[PDB]
Every structure is written in C-alpha cells, then in structure tokens.
Amino acid sequence: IENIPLAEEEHNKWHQDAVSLHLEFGIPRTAAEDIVQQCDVCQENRGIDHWQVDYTHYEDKIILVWVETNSGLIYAERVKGETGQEFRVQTMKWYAMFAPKSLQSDNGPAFVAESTQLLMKYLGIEHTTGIPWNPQSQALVERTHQTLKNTLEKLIPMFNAFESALAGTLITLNIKRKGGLGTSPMDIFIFNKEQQRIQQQSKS
Amino acid sequence: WIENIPLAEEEHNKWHQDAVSLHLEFGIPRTAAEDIVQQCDVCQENKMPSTLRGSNKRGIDHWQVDYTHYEDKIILVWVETNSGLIYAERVKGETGQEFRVQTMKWYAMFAPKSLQSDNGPAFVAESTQLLMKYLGIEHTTGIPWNPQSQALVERTHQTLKNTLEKLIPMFNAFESALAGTLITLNIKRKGGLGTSPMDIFIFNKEQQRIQQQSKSKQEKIRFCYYRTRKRGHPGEWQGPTQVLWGGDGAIVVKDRGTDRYLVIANKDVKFIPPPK
Amino acid sequence: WIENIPLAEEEHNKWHQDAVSLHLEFGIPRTAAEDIVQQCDVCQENKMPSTLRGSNKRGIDHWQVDYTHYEDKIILVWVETNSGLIYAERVKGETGQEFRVQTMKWYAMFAPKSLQSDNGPAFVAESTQLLMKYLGIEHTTGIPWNPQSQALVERTHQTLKNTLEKLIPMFNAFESALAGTLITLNIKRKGGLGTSPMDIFIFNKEQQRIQQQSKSKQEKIRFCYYRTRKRGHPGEWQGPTQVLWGGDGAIVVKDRGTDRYLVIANKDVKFIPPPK
Amino acid sequence: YRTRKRGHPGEWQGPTQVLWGGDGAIVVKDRGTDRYLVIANKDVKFIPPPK
DNA sequence: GCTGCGAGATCCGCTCC
DNA sequence: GGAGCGGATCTCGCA
DNA sequence: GCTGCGAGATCCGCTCC
DNA sequence: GGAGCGGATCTCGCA
Ligand SMILES: [Ca+2]
Ligand SMILES: [Ca+2]
Ligand SMILES: [Zn+2]
Ligand SMILES: [Zn+2]
Ligand SMILES: [Zn+2]
C-alpha cells in the first residue's frame, strides 16, 4: 500500500520508467502507468507484453519479425508476400502462441485496414500506429534485424530448408544466448508472465 | 479327499467343468480344483487372453506427436503430457523433411526433453534420428499395431476436432480456425481449479530454473542406520546411509543394493553421533 | 453480476468457452453459465449424443431367440432370462417353416409365456405371428439396428462358442458336440451358490402351480386409510384401501389413481374398526 | 499422484503438497492412511498451489 | 410406447489355526 | 505371524 | 526391455439461508 | 423445509 506513495515520491524525485518501478516496488502496472501519465515533464517530451512488428528483405526472402520490447524475445516467420490476409493469419497465430496486451507498428498498407483493425479489436489488444517517438524502439529493432540477419548468414549452410535456418537462428537468439545473471531472453518472459498471473490472481 | 481326486479329474476330463463346480460337487478344496482346471491342456489352449493394462509416461517435458486427417487436410498435433497444452499445425504431406522442419520449429518455440511416437515413414528414419540426437531429445517408439500406446494425443484428436467444428464458419481461413481453437483450448479453457494449461506450463517452466537450486551450497549433512522390514520381521542394519530428507515420523533412504527409494518409520531408524 | 452478463455472453459467442471457464473468469453463477452455454445454437448442434442405457426384461417365462453361424453351420439359440438355461439346435436354413417347426417343438418341450426377438425374414411374417397367437405367446420385437437389445442371447453366443470349441475333437458328430455343450452349460455348471440353471428352472416351474394358491379360499380381509407424502408434507386421506400385505413398521397400498404399489410407514397408516 | 492396484492404475488422487522431490521419485503425504508414500515421476502431475 | 451382458482372471483384507 | 478365502474389479467381444 | 484416454452430461447428498 | 453445489459415474470414439 505504502509502495504507491513511495513510487510517486521516487518518480517525482528522479522520473524513472514504469518497468523499473514495477520491478523494484512490485506496484500494480496500472498504478505505474497512472503515475507515468500524471508527469507533465514526461508527457510533454519499455512496457511488458509490448510488441513491435516489422518486415525484412533477405535476397528476395520476406521475413515477418515480432520483437518484445521488455524482453529480447524474437519471433520470426516467412511470408509469401505483403498481404492483409497473410498478416491477419500470422498475427492470429502470434496471439495464439503468446499472451500479448499491446502492439506498436508503422503505417503500412496491410498494417492499416478496416479488416485488420476490426480483427485486432476482436482479439482485444491496444494498437498504436505512427512514427515512433521514444528513441529506444528504433535502435532495438535495428539491433534485432542486424543480429537476425548475421545469424541467418552464419547458420544457412548447415541446414537445408530456409525455415530450418530461421528456426535455428531463433533458437540461438532466444534460448542459447544468455546475459545478465546467467538468464536467457526466454526465461525472463516466463518469469514476467508468472508474475503477472500471480498478481492477477491475488488482486482478482 | 484324496480318494475322490481321480474322480474329479476324470469328470473334468470328460466334461470340462469349472473349478467352482468341482469344489461344490466333490467337496475338493478350491485350490485343488484350480490346479486341476489350470492343468487342462484343452482349457489352456482355448482360454481368453489376459487383460492387464498400463498407463502412459506422463512426464513433465514429455510430448506426443501424431498425424490426423480432417476433410482432405493433414494436421500434425503435439501434446504435452503434464500440463495438457497442445500445438497443431497444417502440413501439406508426411515427408521426412516437413516433419523435421516442424519438429525443429517446435523445439525452437519451447525446449522439451522427451518425445513419444509410433512407427511411421517419417517418425523413424535415418535423418530424423540424427536430427533428434543433434537437438538432444530422448525418443521412444511404441509397440506396432498398438494405437492405445499414444492415448493422450488420440484423445486430444477428439477434443480438437469437436471444438474446431464450431469455429469453421467464423473464419474463412483454415489456419485462422486452427489458431482460434488453440486459443479456446489453451488459454480460455480455465478448467479444474481455475488455471489454464498454458498457466501450468508457464509455472513448470519458471520453477525449472537450476540457478535457484544453485543459489545455496551450504547444508547440514547427516548419516543414518536403517534395516529392512519383510513381513514384519526385522532384519539387520545395512551400512550407513546419507539422509535424503527428514520429516516427522518417517525418513527416506536410498538403497544402493536395489538402487531404490524407501520410507522407514522412526521405530526402525537410528542416527549416528555427529562429528565432534 | 448483471452488468458483466453481456460481456460473458459475447465472450462465449466469440470463443465458445465452457460454463466452468465463464464462472471462474467473470464470477457469474454456475447456473447462469450453464444457461448461457446450453442456449448456444452452435454448441447444441455439435454436441455429443446423450448416453443413457437400460436393461432387458429379465422375466420368469421370458425367452430370447437368435441365429448364429459357426464354420458353415447355422445354430438357433433360445435363452431363458431368469434361470439362464439355454437350448441350441442346428438348423439347415432360416426359412419361416423351419423356424415355426423349431419354435413349436420348443413350446412342446416346456411351456413359456413371452418371447423377445429382433427383425428378420422369419422372426416377423404372417404365418409365424398366426402360429404365436395360436400358441398364446407374447411376442416383442426390438428396435432395428440395435443388436444390444437382445444382449442375453448375444452373450450366450460367446459362452456357447467358447465351450463348444473344446468338445469338437471329442465327438465326430456336430449334434453330439451340441448335446455335450448343453450338458456342460446346463447341468454341470453348478455356478454361484451351487445350483445349476436347470435346477433353478425346475424349481420355478414347480412353484408356479396355481392349485397350491387355490388350496385356501378363506382369509381375513381388512381395510385401511392412508395419505400421500410429498417432500415431507402430509396430504389428505384418499379413500379406503384393501390391505395387500401387513408386515412390521410398514404396509403396502395399491393406489388406483396411479394404479401403482406404494409403501407407507405405520406413522401415516390407520385402520378402520372391524365389523361388529 | 496415483498408485497401481490389482495390476491397473488408480484414480488421480489429490490435489496435495509435495514434501521432498528428488531424481526419479518424490515423497508425498497421503490422507487416506496418513502414511508417507514415494511415487516415481512417471505417474505424477505438477500443479501450482491453489488460492 | 423400451431397454447390455457376463465369463475368466487376479489380487486385498479378512480371520482362523 | 502363516494360511486360505469370499468378493470387488478389470477388459473384451458377441450382434 | 513398457504402457488408455477424457469431455460432456446427469443426478444425489450435502449444508446454508 | 427450499436452495445451489461439489463430486462420483456413465458411455463412446479417437487410432
Ligand atoms: Ca445376432
Ligand atoms: Ca493416430
Ligand atoms: Zn516523470
Ligand atoms: Zn479341462
Ligand atoms: Zn457456444
């Protein structure tokens, strides 16, 4: 209970981000978002289960890439072409495999349509389309693209199918790679999901 | 007793009666009648096959994979034994390369430890076994012509087809219907105590971390003396054993001779003095 | 409560969840979730058929008749429901005349009162129904394409074939083997408490004599007053009734309005004064 | 947990809290007989604690 | 205006010698 | 404590 | 050198208002 | 005494 006033005071003194406050005080995510929105300095100028969707060209190969902002979890697939139907199928599969809550993307033909917007409202996920303003998503997705193409170039000759190489790159960049206190970019996502589940169960 | 035993034997030879009938007729013991009837070669030859049944592995990181057909569509289904989470994908055929791609994608999505499957053109081959050894997954093959071996995936076939029948009109694309039935069978199930299978899988994966177990390297070590107990007859103390876990009223001892875990009550357990 | 009911309804429309899932998610009552899920037309259309099963007539003079094949041989089997006695005969074909001869021979051997059979070229026809009316036997025909209706004769088919497999080498004639298996399944069975099915049939036939019941024509006659008992709420006295049998702590009353036998405890039973 | 009775598996008894879990088997407290029972990993399921 | 069935194996829990 | 023993329980295959 | 399974209906016996 | 409710029980069909 006192964690909410403590977080409010600390944000007034330092103006940190919501994820750090949630991790270090255990305050509800809604309270952290309310505190963030209530800061005029931050408003006038890294969320859990926040995703970014992008396309990638690889010497005529079309790759759809999904990047989680909080955790370096990358989901890559092969798409025949930029089409609304294919994007809707891919995004429904993506929602089938994970439990997202928000999405961010650029302004595109298949991205912006009445059918896909209706489908995403049907799923119940917040969508934000426009030019990014936080100078972190662009750099993060650029690093994701660079690492993904580097690993794909490295691992292509070992396997036969291109999808096989893509799966191998996903294995390398999601499980085998480690950082911090010996943690993987996939174990962090599981820990965050478990924390969200236990908080939701405790609250309601 | 002994005198009428040949009479009962010849009567059963002539008519092939039952043991209960012989016992009730000639007064012979039930054991004697059972021995007589079980020794009949004719009865043994025409006896019905034994009915004993077992159960599946039901491991934590254990997965069962199978193919199925649905209106000129081929679906590959993976079923997790512990949580019950399922993963289905539409596959053009049943070639080895397609199965290899699908299984390594399945490994990429989450890390398993064992797989159970039946005989098949793609399940067992040269390249697929090499791939599974490369990934490091234990593979077990069931008895041929025993579809009951992979019971879990067979039941999930019903649970998937029945639910997928509902969502076909909603979506024009078959893959969309598959994703929707995955939603309604994985996240929106919330069966039992109120936890979806995905929640169980997430919890099991979270608690599987070994760094938590490696956090503490200091723990008290004690040794114990125990003896066996056969038919209530006490035995003899069998060496010193390291205590595995100490509770109240009982203890657990790992027998090296049988290499098995046993539980011993405090009345048959004694403790060596600690070092001083 | 009421506010989230449309939310649960639309969620079930979108995903077709289960009632338990809706109750655990939105907190709606289990009854409300059951009503919502049962009102879904899609769920009703694809729901699995109901599983309720019954039992056979199991009458005293009730017989079930059926045909069977055994290595280019046709066997007609009659099974008595109560005792379990069986009677099998080799028949050249399945014509109506052969069945009529066999069934009237079966009537000649012992007198039944009812028969149960399925649809067939000879079981149902014009001449056979006339013959059964001539003999005075109630005939019942089971539901078509429901072989489970005549379960008793179907099980006796197994019990006959399995035993007949043993006695084929002993006798060169097939009819001899049939007679031997009739011996070993009727007289030499002696199953259960130690009474063969033929003994049960003989006892039931012996006690069926009506002259014993007609020996005594004098008996005390009494009348009684009783009332119904619904949910523990007493009703009103419903006319005078003739006592059927008087025991201790209870009595039996035949309700004419429902035409059924009921048991009433002494606390709800009173007796009219006897005539004086 | 579940046990083998008369050569066939029994019903899924539980839920219950595990006491000690090692390699191969875990030890659990039974309510029917108030006795400790050791059961291998091939006939168990793992569930997070309820509310 | 009606319907599933049991024979043949296997142990537990029992009490009695 | 050894001992047999009555009975609940299991599957499968008649159509 | 290993294996049957559960989803979807229906009542009883229960206790609580 | 009305009331809902948790749980034991049933069949059938995946191969
Ligand atoms: Ca038949
Ligand atoms: Ca199969
Ligand atoms: Zn701020
Ligand atoms: Zn014999
Ligand atoms: Zn519905």
The domain locations on chain D are: 1-47
Distance (Å, rounded) from C-alpha B172 to C-alpha B71?
15
Contact assessment for residue A156 and residue A174, using Cβ atoms and an 8 Å cutoff? no
Distance (Å, rounded) from C-alpha B225 to C-alpha B273?
11
Structure tokens at A95: 């929602």
Which residues face C265 on adjacent strands? C250
A130: left (phi over 0), alpha (psi -120 to 50) or beta: left
List subunits contacting chain B, requiring 3 or more Cβ pairs under 8 Å. A, C, D
- Residue C206, SS3? helix
Contact assessment for residue D19 and residue D28, using Cβ atoms and an 8 Å cutoff? yes
Contact assessment for residue C106 and residue C113, using Cβ atoms and an 8 Å cutoff? no
What is the CATH code of the structural domain delimited by A50-191?
3.30.420.10
Cβ-nearest to B263 among D15, D38, D41: D38
A190/chain B closest Cα distance in angstroms: 6
Residue C41: alpha-carbon gap to chain centroid = 36
The DSSP 8-state label assigned to residue D23 in this structure reads S
Residue reference for tokens 């400790």: D36
Distance (Å, rounded) from C-alpha C153 to C-alpha C159?
10
Nearest to residue B119, comparing CAs of B91, B147, B95? Answer: B147
C247: left (phi over 0), alpha (psi -120 to 50) or beta: beta
Measure CA to C1' and name the residue nearest F10. Answer: B51
Angle between helices A18-25 and A3-14 (to 10 degrees): 140
Distance (Å, rounded) from C-alpha C130 to C-alpha B30?
52
Residue C87: CB partners within 8 Å, gap ≥ 6? C77, C78, C106, C109, C182
What distances in angstroms separate CA C252 from CA C248, C264, C275, one per listed residue?
A: 11, 6, 22
Q: Is the CB of C195 under 7 A from strand E?
A: no
CB environment A11-27: b (16+ within 10 A), e (fewer): beeeebbbbebbeebeb
Q: Is the CB of B30 under 7 A from strand F?
A: yes
- Measured CA to C1', what is the nucleotide nearest C56? E3
* End-to-end CA, chain D: 20
Distance (Å, rounded) from C-alpha D24 to C-alpha D40?
6
Q: Of the ligands numbered here, which is closest to the C-alpha atom of C10?
A: 5
Residue reference for tokens 């005078």: C240
Separation of CA B60 and C1' G1 in angstroms?
22
Structure tokens at C189: 């069975």
CB contact under 8 A, B252 and D47: no
Q: Which residues surround ligand 4, an ion (CB under 5 A)?
A: B 16, 40, 43
CB contact under 8 A, D20 and B244: yes
Distance (Å, rounded) from C-alpha C117 to C-alpha A171?
67
Distance (Å, rounded) from C-alpha A158 to C-alpha A165?
8
Structure tokens at A63: 């790759």
In chain D, what are the helix, strand and coil shares in percent, each to the nearest 5? 5, 35, 60
The residue count of chain B comes to 276
Nearest to residue B58, comparing CAs of D2, C48, A8, A193? Answer: D2
C235/chain B closest Cα distance in angstroms: 45
Q: After which residues do gaps appear in chain A, with C to N over 2.5 Å?
A: 45
Residue C235: alpha-carbon gap to chain centroid = 34
- Residue C230, SS3? strand
Residue C47: CB partners within 8 Å, gap ≥ 6? none
Spacing, Cα C195 to ligand 4 middle (Å): 20
D contacts of B60 (beta carbons < 8 Å): 41, 46
Nearest to residue A58, comparing CAs of A41, A42, A85, A79? Answer: A79
Contact assessment for residue B67 and residue B56, using Cβ atoms and an 8 Å cutoff? no
Residue A203: CB partners within 8 Å, gap ≥ 6? A28
For residue C106, the tally of other CB atoms under 10 A from its CB is 17
User: In the 3-class helix/strand/coil scheme, how is chain B assigned residue by residue?
Assistant: CCCCHHHHHHHHHHHCCCHHHHHHHHCCCHHHHHHHHHCCHHHHHCCCCCCCCCCCCCCCCEEEEEEEECCCCEEEEEEECCCCCEEEEECCCCCHHHHHHHHHHHHHHCCCCEEEECCCCCCCCHHHHHHHHHHCCEEEECCCCCHHHHHHHHHHHHHHHHHHHHHCCCCCCHHHHHHHHHHHHHCCCCCCCCCCHHHHHHHHHHHCCHHHHCCCCCCCCCEEEEEEEECCEEEEEEEEEECCCECCCEEEEEECCCCEEEEEEHHHEEECCCCC
Distance (Å, rounded) from C-alpha C157 to C-alpha C164?
10
Structure tokens at A159: 């396997």
Which residues face C77 on adjacent strands? C66, C88
Contact assessment for residue A82 and residue A55, using Cβ atoms and an 8 Å cutoff? yes
What distances in angstroms separate CA B136 from CA B18, B115, B131, one per listed residue?
A: 56, 11, 8
What is the CATH code of the structural domain delimited by D1-47?
2.30.30.10
Residue B107: CB partners within 8 Å, gap ≥ 6? A167, A171, B135, B137
B185, closest residue in chain A (CA to CA) = A96
Structure tokens at A42: 């931050």
Spacing, Cα B167 to ligand 5 middle (Å): 10
* End-to-end CA, chain A: 16
- Residue D25, SS3? strand
Position B208: which residue type? Q
Separation of CA A9 and C1' E9 in angstroms?
77
Distance (Å, rounded) from C-alpha C33 to C-alpha B169?
24
List subunits contacting chain C, requiring 3 or more Cβ pairs under 8 Å. B
CB environment C189-227: b (16+ within 10 A), e (fewer): bbbeeeebbbbbbeeeeeeeeeeeeeeeeeeeeeebebe
Contact assessment for residue D1 and residue D37, using Cβ atoms and an 8 Å cutoff? yes
Distance (Å, rounded) from C-alpha D35 to C-alpha A151?
55
Cβ-nearest to B245 among D20, D37, D45: D20
Distance (Å, rounded) from C-alpha D8 to C-alpha D2?
11
Does A106 show up as a binding residue in the annotation? yes
Distance (Å, rounded) from C-alpha D41 to C-alpha D21?
9
Distance (Å, rounded) from C-alpha A185 to C-alpha A179?
8
Separation of CA A81 and C1' H6 in angstroms?
53
- Decide: residue A184, CB within 10 A, 0-12 exposed, 13-18 middle, 19+ buried: buried
Position B157: which residue type? H
Distance (Å, rounded) from C-alpha A198 to C-alpha A192?
10
Nearest to residue A127, comparing CAs of A113, A139, A145, A140? Answer: A113
Spacing, Cα B37 to ligand 3 middle (Å): 90
Structure tokens at A66: 């999904």
Distance (Å, rounded) from C-alpha D4 to C-alpha D26?
16
Nearest to residue B100, comparing CAs of B118, B64, B127? Answer: B127
Which residues face C117 on adjacent strands? C141
For residue A115, the tally of other CB atoms under 10 A from its CB is 12
Nearest to residue B55, comparing CAs of D43, D37, D29? Answer: D43
Structure tokens at C162: 């399995």
β-pairing, B233-242 vs B223-230, is antiparallel
Nearest to residue C100, comparing CAs of C69, C75, C135, C70? Answer: C135
Interior angle at CA B121, CA B116 and CA B124, nearest 5 = 45
What is the CATH code of the structural domain delimited by B62-208?
3.30.420.10
Phi and psi (nearest 5°) for A185? -65, -10
Contact assessment for residue C183 and residue B15, using Cβ atoms and an 8 Å cutoff? yes
| Sheet containing strand A74-78, strands side by side | A74-78, A61-68, A50-58, A102-105, A126-129
β-pairing, D18-21 vs A102-105, is unpaired
Contact assessment for residue C85 and residue C102, using Cβ atoms and an 8 Å cutoff? no
What DSSP assignment string belongs to chain A? -THHHHHHHHHHHH---HHHHHHHH---HHHHHHHHHT-HHHHH---TTEEEEEEEEETTEEEEEEEESSS--EEEEE-SSS-HHHHHHHHHHHHHHS---EEEE---TTTS-HHHHHHHHHHT-EEEES---STTHHHHHHHHHHHHHHHHHHHTTTSSSHHHHHHHHHHIIIII--BTTTB-TTHHHHHHHHHHHHHHHHH-
